[PDB]
Amino acid sequence: ESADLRALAKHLYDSYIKSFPLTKAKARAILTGKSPFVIYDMNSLMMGEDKIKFKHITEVAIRIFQGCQFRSVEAVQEITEYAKSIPGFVNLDLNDQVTLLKYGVHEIIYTMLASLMNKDGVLISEGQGFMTREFLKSLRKPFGDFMEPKFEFAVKFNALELDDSDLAIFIAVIILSGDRPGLLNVKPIEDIQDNLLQALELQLKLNHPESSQLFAKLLQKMTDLRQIVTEHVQLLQVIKKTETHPLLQEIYKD
Amino acid sequence: ESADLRALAKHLYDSYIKSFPLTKAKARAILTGKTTDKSPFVIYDMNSLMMGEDKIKEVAIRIFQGCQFRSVEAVQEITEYAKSIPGFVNLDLNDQVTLLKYGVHEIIYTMLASLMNKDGVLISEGQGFMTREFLKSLRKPFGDFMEPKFEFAVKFNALELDDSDLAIFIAVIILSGDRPGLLNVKPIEDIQDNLLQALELQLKLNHPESSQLFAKLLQKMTDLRQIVTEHVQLLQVIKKTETDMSLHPLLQEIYKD
Ligand SMILES: Cc1ccc(COc2cccc(CNc3nnn[nH]3)c2)cc1
Ligand SMILES: Cc1ccc(COc2cccc(CNc3nnn[nH]3)c2)cc1
């Protein structure tokens, strides 16, 4: 059994590597010791677009948001491709695959955004840029407080010092949550999650021997993830209520 | 590599099933009396059309408006599916919009063929079936909307594609680097090259005794273009004649420019 959990851990890490171009290791390397272009106020953002070839650019506050929606839609596709490698996922009922992705992408998006944040800012644009936390906060209400709860989560989450090999298994666990509303067949889902939890537990024990109950502590963060998503939806229900193009709004439904 | 193209074919098929609730497989089981599905109520005339409400302006306007609601829903589905085509969401955003703007019709009339035979067309997710002759008896010019779509469907349906074939083909259609106004033609053409390569292998494996089916399928892109032009010129007549009637905003933003 233990050899099997090592094998599963290795398979997931390989898939994560093929699926996510900017890994946590690569991001920490950029945030520590080339280097990214920095956006810290209104002036460095005008320059930042000249320089960085933004794929999302057709007012300041909404334009940064739309780019966050752009990259998030890109992230969905990366997570979806990763999910397919999780053993048993593709044998699940199709509707349930869709249901698991739909309710899980937001949680995985904020998990992986933390790999790319520190207390001072967040990498953007595949790490070519770095946008400070102060400039984000300084955005007019209600735009200057959607990334702030993200940062505060990332601070605490990053203090657990997970690497990519850890996150690969953790992300699979989130996807295989048997309590998403509207699932048809919870068995194989909760069955696969049991195997993944067993592998994450062994991974954390071998990779962080001195970090007692890191397994438990990481589980406790899934609580914080659910809380942030529900609070994010509440802001999304207002950016779709305060700020008011048909084809574009169709691409960025949800 | 063939193994990689097979994986692309599987990906698109799997995403196609997730995006389009009413497949060709389900439509044919409804139209050919199979017992996996149910028989449609058939609308011929004012009398059945009126019984169709109690089972599923004026007549011709009401059919047109409902057909417009359906086009909007299809545009929503085709949008979801496009985001699944690898590389699509990584393209410049203005081009994504452009690829959907010119793409959705060619795809709509492709998938509308799945819902047709020579005698009429499934409606309301297959619960209903409206005849080709009733659609032509509609007053001018609403009676001319549907007939060219029937003529294409009859020829297109003789290729005998199933949903796995269609999924790659509609992907090829979205990723056309000759759409007007595109900014970065090259990355769009790089993706279509893989899509075309995947469709080629898919057609050879799924239809091994169907020679030049790949060529024959690319050739229908000609018939698709003509349907769109005709359809647009027909919508311009109603815009000048029924100044009380409104096009849905998603639809009007597609036809603009
Ligand atoms: C792994 C991952 C998942 C989701 C997201 C999506 O979340 C964000 C938030 C802030 C900036 C960016 C980068 N792109 C951008 N946004 N604004 N300008 N460039 C993305 C990023 C990574
Ligand atoms: C409930 C209902 C469903 C379908 C129809 C009509 O059948 C369809 C079905 C799908 C696409 C199109 C597009 N064809 C078109 N667009 N504008 N004019 N013709 C026509 C009428 C009522």
Contact A55 B101 (CB under 8 A): no
- Name residue, tokens 């990259």: A71
What does the block give as tokens for A35? 């280097």
Q: How far is CA B249 from CA A241, B19, B137, B232, in A?
A: 18, 22, 29, 16
Whether residue B86 lies within 8 A of chain A, CB to CB, comes out as yes
Q: Which residues, other chains included, contact A165 with Cβ-Cβ below 8 Å and sequence gap of 6+?
A: A9, A13, A203, A207
Q: Report how many Cβ contacts below 8 Å link chain A to chain B.
A: 53
A interface mutation test: which of B93, B98, B179 has the most A CBs within 10 A?
A: B93
Each residue of A9-36: b (16+ CB within 10 Å) or e? bebbbebbeebbebbbebbbebbeeeeb
Rounded-to-integer distance, Cα A52 and Cα A50, Å: 6
Sheet containing strand A129-132, strands side by side? A37-39, A129-132, A121-124, A117-118
What does the block give as tokens for B241? 């004649």
Phi/psi class of residue B87: alpha, beta or left (left: φ > 0; alpha: ψ in -120 to 50)?
A: left
What does the block give as tokens for B254? 């597609």
Q: Which residues, other chains included, contact A57 with Cβ-Cβ below 8 Å and sequence gap of 6+?
A: A49, A63, A67, B93
CB atoms within 10 A of CB A213: 10
SS3 at position B90: coil
Alpha helices in chain A (DSSP H): 2-19, 24-31, 42-51, 60-85, 94-114, 133-137, 148-158, 164-175, 186-207, 214-239, 246-251
Q: How close is the Cα of B218 to the center of ligand 2, in Å? A: 25
Q: Is A138 annotated in some ligand binding site?
A: no
Give the count of domains, chain B: 1
Q: After which residues is chain B broken (C to N over 2.5 A)?
A: 56
Residues forming beta bridges with residue B116, ordered by sequence position:
B121
Rounded-to-integer distance, Cα B129 and Cα B34, Å: 15
Residues in B touching A97 (Cβ below 8 Å): 18
Determine whether A46 is exposed, middle or buried from the number of CB atoms within 10 Å of its CB (0-12, 13-18, 19+): exposed
Provide the residue range defining the domain that includes A239.
1-254
* Atom 12 of ligand 1, residue of closest alpha carbon: A124
Q: Which residues of B are annotated as a binding site?
A: 68-71, 105, 231, 255
| Resolution expressed in Å | 2.3
Phi/psi class of residue A107: alpha, beta or left (left: φ > 0; alpha: ψ in -120 to 50)?
A: alpha
Method used to obtain the model? X-ray
Determine whether B1 is exposed, middle or buried from the number of CB atoms within 10 Å of its CB (0-12, 13-18, 19+): exposed
Residues in B touching A55 (Cβ below 8 Å): 90-93
